[PDB]
């Protein structure tokens, strides 16, 4: 139907909150590669044979033609990174989790946003192409920049190669499909159960957040018997997407759900919301070889980070596994880790993010 149009308008209101004029510029080739001092979120990732290829790509886009990988990434960043930097500066309340600092108050902010309409909460990821939602991503970028007919054509041409290209290309795009596809699901879930609500009632019953293809969705009890994992998964295949649950209940609680390979843990003693990383991920950070074979430059640092990551689980888990990781590294290398205590890591996070 013409619901893509109302999805797009609702989303725009949300995603455009907090606009800064200093960010509505296409970046120079140098800014695209080494960042700019306008944002903490525009940062730095032959020297003149590829600039000549970016040039060929930009001009060919200006006349409507697209070409066929590093030059694509720099171009895309030039025309889109200010927008992405805007989403990151207004993160979480704008439904976009790109830029979340899980060691900081962002995590409790994410929790405050996913408990806004009660206790029911779901999570999962989508998989496929739907060029009608993708199209509108170019549109919303263009609406953000307001910089002329030519730039708009370039954003539309670049977006057509994003999936075949990189990380900053598909990740905010899939965030957009999330915010869009789940307002659409809300509307098609109300027609199949004959509820006299419209997409403008989404923002009164649903709070959501996304990181690329992965989301967490909070919804009120009022809407929960017709808008939940079961119905939303079905609605989402009407749009061309499989929508699996990470790990089928109709809802859960914020403490049961996994997001960015982490969980929402409230620490009763230290009264704080923390982001324990899955042990299966933590435990692939060290090199366990007892002969210290492929010890790379970052092996020591990888071990230290794994142990820092243990400090956001309960203390029992940090006490068990930090000793295991510490002894393994010692026997393998004959060297030692510089690690902190449990409350030492907690204090590190307080001094840097709560103060
Ligand atoms: Cl299509
Ligand atoms: Cl775990
Ligand atoms: Cl987990
Ligand atoms: Cl071994
Ligand atoms: Mg993912
Ligand atoms: Mg593993």
Coordinates of C-alpha atoms and ligand atoms in Angstrom, one line a residue:
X1 CA 0.0 0.0 0.0
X2 CA 0.9 3.7 0.6
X3 CA 2.0 2.8 4.1
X4 CA 5.7 3.0 3.1
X5 CA 4.9 6.7 2.9
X6 CA 3.7 7.0 6.5
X7 CA 6.4 4.7 7.8
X8 CA 8.9 7.0 6.1
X9 CA 7.3 10.1 7.6
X10 CA 7.1 8.8 11.2
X11 CA 10.7 7.5 10.9
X12 CA 11.9 10.9 9.6
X13 CA 10.5 12.8 12.6
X14 CA 12.5 10.4 14.9
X15 CA 15.7 10.1 13.0
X16 CA 16.0 13.8 12.3
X17 CA 15.8 15.0 15.9
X18 CA 18.9 16.8 17.1
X19 CA 20.1 18.0 13.7
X20 CA 23.2 20.2 13.7
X21 CA 24.0 22.5 10.8
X22 CA 27.7 21.8 11.1
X23 CA 27.1 18.2 10.0
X24 CA 25.2 18.7 6.7
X25 CA 28.3 18.8 4.5
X26 CA 29.7 16.2 2.1
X27 CA 33.2 15.5 3.3
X28 CA 36.4 16.0 1.4
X29 CA 38.4 13.0 0.2
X30 CA 40.8 13.9 3.0
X31 CA 38.0 14.2 5.6
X32 CA 36.6 10.8 4.5
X33 CA 39.9 9.0 5.1
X34 CA 41.3 10.9 8.1
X35 CA 38.2 12.2 9.7
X36 CA 37.2 15.7 10.7
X37 CA 37.1 17.7 13.9
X38 CA 33.4 18.5 13.5
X39 CA 32.4 15.2 15.2
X40 CA 33.9 12.5 17.4
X41 CA 32.1 10.2 15.0
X42 CA 34.0 11.3 11.8
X43 CA 37.3 9.6 12.3
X44 CA 40.3 8.2 10.4
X45 CA 39.6 5.2 8.3
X46 CA 47.9 4.5 -4.1
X47 CA 47.4 7.8 -2.1
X48 CA 46.5 9.5 -5.4
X49 CA 45.6 6.7 -7.7
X50 CA 42.5 5.9 -5.7
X51 CA 41.5 9.5 -5.3
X52 CA 41.4 9.4 -9.1
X53 CA 39.0 6.4 -8.8
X54 CA 36.8 8.2 -6.3
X55 CA 36.7 11.1 -8.8
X56 CA 35.6 8.7 -11.5
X57 CA 32.9 7.3 -9.3
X58 CA 31.5 10.6 -8.1
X59 CA 31.3 12.1 -11.6
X60 CA 29.7 9.0 -13.1
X61 CA 27.1 9.2 -10.3
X62 CA 26.4 12.8 -11.0
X63 CA 25.3 11.8 -14.5
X64 CA 23.2 8.9 -13.1
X65 CA 25.6 6.0 -13.9
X66 CA 26.9 3.5 -11.3
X67 CA 30.2 1.6 -11.4
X68 CA 31.3 -1.8 -10.0
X69 CA 35.6 -1.4 -3.6
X70 CA 37.9 1.0 -1.6
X71 CA 36.9 3.9 -3.9
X72 CA 33.2 3.0 -3.3
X73 CA 33.7 3.0 0.5
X74 CA 35.4 6.4 0.5
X75 CA 32.7 7.9 -1.8
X76 CA 29.9 6.5 0.3
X77 CA 31.5 7.9 3.4
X78 CA 31.9 11.3 1.8
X79 CA 28.2 11.6 0.9
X80 CA 26.8 9.9 4.0
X81 CA 29.1 10.1 7.0
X82 CA 27.8 13.4 8.3
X83 CA 24.4 11.9 8.4
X84 CA 25.6 8.8 10.2
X85 CA 27.5 11.0 12.6
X86 CA 24.2 12.8 13.3
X87 CA 22.5 9.5 14.1
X88 CA 25.4 8.6 16.4
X89 CA 25.2 11.9 18.3
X90 CA 21.5 11.5 18.9
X91 CA 21.7 7.7 19.4
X92 CA 19.3 5.5 21.3
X93 CA 16.4 8.0 21.7
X94 CA 16.5 8.2 17.8
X95 CA 16.2 4.3 17.7
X96 CA 19.7 4.0 16.3
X97 CA 22.3 2.2 18.5
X98 CA 25.3 2.9 16.3
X99 CA 27.9 4.5 18.5
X100 CA 26.7 3.1 21.8
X101 CA 29.3 2.9 24.5
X102 CA 28.3 -0.2 26.5
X103 CA 30.7 0.7 29.4
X104 CA 28.9 4.1 29.9
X105 CA 25.5 5.3 30.8
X106 CA 24.3 4.6 27.2
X107 CA 23.5 1.1 28.4
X108 CA 21.1 2.2 31.1
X109 CA 19.8 4.8 28.6
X110 CA 19.1 1.9 26.3
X111 CA 17.3 0.1 29.1
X112 CA 15.3 3.2 30.1
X113 CA 14.1 3.4 26.4
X114 CA 13.2 -0.4 26.2
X115 CA 11.1 -0.3 29.4
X116 CA 9.2 2.9 28.4
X117 CA 5.9 1.0 27.7
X118 CA 6.1 -1.7 30.3
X119 CA 7.7 -5.1 30.7
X120 CA 7.2 -6.9 27.4
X121 CA 10.3 -6.9 25.1
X122 CA 11.5 -9.0 22.1
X123 CA 14.7 -9.2 20.1
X124 CA 16.0 -10.8 16.9
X125 CA 17.5 -10.2 13.5
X126 CA 16.2 -9.9 9.9
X127 CA 17.5 -11.4 6.7
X128 CA 16.5 -11.1 3.1
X129 CA 16.0 -7.4 -1.6
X130 CA 13.4 -4.7 -0.8
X131 CA 14.5 -1.7 -3.0
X132 CA 11.4 0.3 -1.8
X133 CA 12.6 0.7 1.7
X134 CA 16.3 1.1 0.6
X135 CA 15.2 3.9 -1.8
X136 CA 13.7 5.8 1.1
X137 CA 17.1 5.6 3.0
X138 CA 18.6 7.8 0.2
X139 CA 15.6 10.1 0.5
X140 CA 16.0 10.6 4.2
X141 CA 19.7 11.3 3.9
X142 CA 18.9 13.8 1.1
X143 CA 16.2 15.4 3.3
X144 CA 18.9 15.8 6.0
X145 CA 21.6 17.4 3.8
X146 CA 19.3 19.6 1.6
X147 CA 22.2 20.2 -0.8
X148 CA 20.9 20.1 -4.3
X149 CA 19.6 17.9 -7.1
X150 CA 23.0 16.6 -8.0
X151 CA 24.0 15.3 -4.5
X152 CA 20.6 13.6 -4.2
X153 CA 21.2 11.7 -7.4
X154 CA 24.7 10.7 -6.1
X155 CA 23.3 9.3 -2.8
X156 CA 20.7 7.3 -4.7
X157 CA 23.4 5.9 -7.1
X158 CA 25.8 5.0 -4.3
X159 CA 23.1 3.3 -2.2
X160 CA 22.5 0.9 -5.1
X161 CA 25.9 -0.9 -4.6
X162 CA 26.0 -1.0 -0.7
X163 CA 25.3 -4.7 -0.3
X164 CA 27.8 -5.7 -3.0
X165 CA 30.6 -3.6 -1.6
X166 CA 31.1 -1.2 4.0
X167 CA 30.3 -1.5 7.6
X168 CA 29.3 2.2 7.8
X169 CA 27.3 1.4 4.6
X170 CA 25.0 -1.5 5.4
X171 CA 24.7 -1.0 9.1
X172 CA 22.8 2.3 9.3
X173 CA 20.8 1.1 6.2
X174 CA 19.7 -1.9 8.1
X175 CA 18.9 0.3 11.1
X176 CA 16.5 2.2 8.7
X177 CA 14.8 -1.0 7.6
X178 CA 14.4 -1.8 11.3
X179 CA 12.7 1.4 12.2
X180 CA 10.7 1.3 9.0
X181 CA 9.8 -2.4 8.8
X182 CA 8.5 -2.4 12.4
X183 CA 6.2 0.5 12.0
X184 CA 4.9 -1.2 8.9
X185 CA 4.5 -4.5 10.9
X186 CA 2.5 -2.5 13.5
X187 CA 0.2 -1.2 10.8
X188 CA -0.3 -4.6 9.1
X189 CA -0.7 -6.2 12.5
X190 CA -3.6 -3.9 13.3
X191 CA -5.4 -4.6 10.1
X192 CA -5.3 -8.4 10.6
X193 CA -6.8 -8.1 14.1
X194 CA -9.1 -5.2 13.3
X195 CA -7.8 -2.7 15.9
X196 CA -8.8 0.9 15.3
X197 CA -5.3 2.2 15.6
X198 CA -2.9 3.6 13.0
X199 CA 0.8 3.9 12.5
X200 CA 0.7 7.3 14.4
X201 CA -0.2 5.1 17.5
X202 CA 3.1 3.3 17.2
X203 CA 5.0 6.0 19.1
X204 CA 2.5 5.7 22.0
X205 CA 2.9 1.9 22.4
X206 CA 6.3 0.8 20.9
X207 CA 9.8 1.8 21.8
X208 CA 12.6 0.1 19.8
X209 CA 16.3 0.2 19.1
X210 CA 18.4 -1.3 16.3
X211 CA 22.0 -2.0 15.4
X212 CA 22.0 -3.0 11.7
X213 CA 19.9 -6.1 11.3
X214 CA 19.6 -6.7 15.1
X215 CA 16.8 -5.1 17.2
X216 CA 15.2 -4.9 20.6
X217 CA 11.5 -3.8 20.7
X218 CA 9.5 -2.8 23.8
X219 CA 5.7 -2.7 23.5
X220 CA 2.8 -1.9 25.9
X221 CA 0.5 -4.5 27.4
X222 CA -2.4 -2.9 25.5
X223 CA -1.0 -3.9 22.1
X224 CA 0.8 -7.1 23.1
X225 CA -1.7 -9.8 22.2
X226 CA -1.8 -8.7 18.5
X227 CA 1.7 -7.1 18.3
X228 CA 4.4 -9.6 19.5
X229 CA 7.1 -12.0 18.3
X230 CA 4.5 -14.3 16.6
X231 CA 2.6 -11.6 14.7
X232 CA 5.7 -9.4 14.0
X233 CA 7.7 -12.3 12.5
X234 CA 4.7 -13.0 10.2
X235 CA 4.2 -9.4 9.3
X236 CA 7.9 -9.1 8.5
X237 CA 7.8 -11.9 5.8
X238 CA 5.1 -9.8 4.1
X239 CA 8.0 -7.4 3.5
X240 CA 10.4 -10.0 2.2
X241 CA 12.4 -10.7 5.5
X242 CA 12.9 -13.7 7.7
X243 CA 12.8 -12.4 11.3
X244 CA 14.4 -15.1 13.7
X245 CA 14.7 -14.8 17.4
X246 CA 18.3 -14.9 18.6
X247 CA 17.7 -17.6 21.2
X248 CA 9.3 -19.0 20.2
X249 CA 7.9 -16.9 23.1
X250 CA 5.5 -14.0 22.4
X251 CA 7.5 -11.7 24.6
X252 CA 10.2 -11.6 27.3
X253 CA 11.8 -9.2 29.8
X254 CA 14.7 -6.8 29.3
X255 CA 16.9 -9.1 31.5
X256 CA 16.4 -12.1 29.3
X257 CA 17.4 -10.7 26.0
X258 CA 20.7 -10.4 24.1
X259 CA 21.8 -7.3 22.1
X260 CA 25.3 -6.6 20.6
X261 CA 26.3 -10.0 22.0
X262 CA 25.6 -8.6 25.5
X263 CA 22.9 -8.6 28.1
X264 CA 21.2 -6.0 30.3
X265 CA 22.5 -6.8 33.8
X266 CA 21.5 -4.7 36.8
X267 CA 24.1 -5.0 39.6
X268 CA 22.2 -4.8 42.9
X269 CA 25.2 -4.0 45.0
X270 CA 26.8 -1.4 42.8
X271 CA 23.4 -0.1 41.5
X272 CA 24.3 0.2 37.8
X273 CA 23.3 -1.3 34.4
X274 CA 26.1 -3.3 32.9
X275 CA 26.7 -5.0 29.5
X276 CA 28.2 -8.5 30.1
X277 CA 29.6 -9.9 26.9
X278 CA 28.7 -13.5 26.1
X279 CA 31.2 -15.9 27.5
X280 CA 31.5 -17.6 24.2
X281 CA 32.8 -14.3 22.7
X282 CA 35.0 -13.4 25.7
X283 CA 36.5 -16.9 25.6
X284 CA 37.7 -16.6 22.0
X285 CA 39.7 -13.5 22.9
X286 CA 42.7 -15.3 24.4
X287 CA 45.1 -17.6 22.6
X288 CA 45.1 -20.8 24.7
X289 CA 48.0 -22.6 23.0
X290 CA 50.2 -23.9 25.8
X291 CA 53.3 -23.5 23.5
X292 CA 52.6 -19.8 22.7
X293 CA 52.6 -20.2 19.0
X294 CA 50.6 -17.6 17.0
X295 CA 51.1 -14.9 19.7
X296 CA 50.5 -11.7 17.8
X297 CA 51.2 -8.1 18.9
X298 CA 47.7 -7.7 20.4
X299 CA 47.6 -11.1 22.2
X300 CA 48.5 -9.4 25.5
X301 CA 46.0 -6.7 24.9
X302 CA 43.3 -9.2 23.8
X303 CA 43.7 -11.0 27.1
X304 CA 43.5 -7.9 29.2
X305 CA 40.3 -6.8 27.3
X306 CA 38.7 -10.2 27.9
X307 CA 39.4 -9.8 31.6
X308 CA 38.0 -6.3 31.7
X309 CA 35.0 -7.7 29.9
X310 CA 34.6 -10.2 32.7
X311 CA 34.1 -7.3 35.2
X312 CA 30.6 -6.7 33.8
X313 CA 29.4 -10.2 34.7
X314 CA 28.8 -11.1 38.3
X315 CA 31.9 -11.2 40.5
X316 CA 31.8 -15.0 40.8
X317 CA 32.3 -15.2 37.0
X318 CA 35.1 -12.6 37.0
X319 CA 36.9 -14.5 39.8
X320 CA 36.8 -17.8 38.0
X321 CA 37.7 -16.9 34.5
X322 CA 40.2 -14.0 35.1
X323 CA 42.4 -16.5 37.0
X324 CA 42.1 -19.0 34.2
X325 CA 42.9 -16.4 31.6
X326 CA 45.7 -15.0 33.7
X327 CA 47.4 -18.3 34.3
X328 CA 47.0 -19.5 30.7
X329 CA 48.8 -16.3 29.4
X330 CA 51.5 -16.8 32.0
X331 CA 52.3 -20.4 31.1
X332 CA 52.2 -19.7 27.4
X333 CA 54.4 -16.5 27.3
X334 CA 56.4 -16.3 30.5
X335 CA 55.1 -12.7 30.6
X336 CA 52.3 -11.2 32.8
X337 CA 49.0 -9.3 32.2
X338 CA 48.4 -5.9 33.6
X339 CA 44.9 -6.3 34.9
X340 CA 42.7 -4.7 37.6
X341 CA 40.5 -5.9 40.3
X342 CA 36.7 -6.3 40.0
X343 CA 35.8 -3.0 41.7
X344 CA 38.8 -1.5 40.0
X345 CA 37.2 -2.0 36.6
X346 CA 33.9 -0.7 38.0
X347 CA 35.7 2.4 39.3
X348 CA 37.4 2.8 35.9
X349 CA 34.0 3.1 34.3
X350 CA 32.6 5.4 37.0
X351 CA 35.4 8.0 36.7
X352 CA 35.1 8.1 32.9
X353 CA 31.4 7.9 32.2
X354 CA 29.4 8.7 35.4
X355 CA 31.3 11.8 36.5
Ligands
LIG1 CL1 11.2 -4.6 -4.9
LIG2 CL1 27.2 -15.7 28.8
LIG3 CL1 24.8 -13.7 26.7
LIG4 CL1 48.3 -26.4 23.1
LIG5 MG1 24.2 -8.4 12.9
LIG6 MG1 33.5 -19.9 20.8

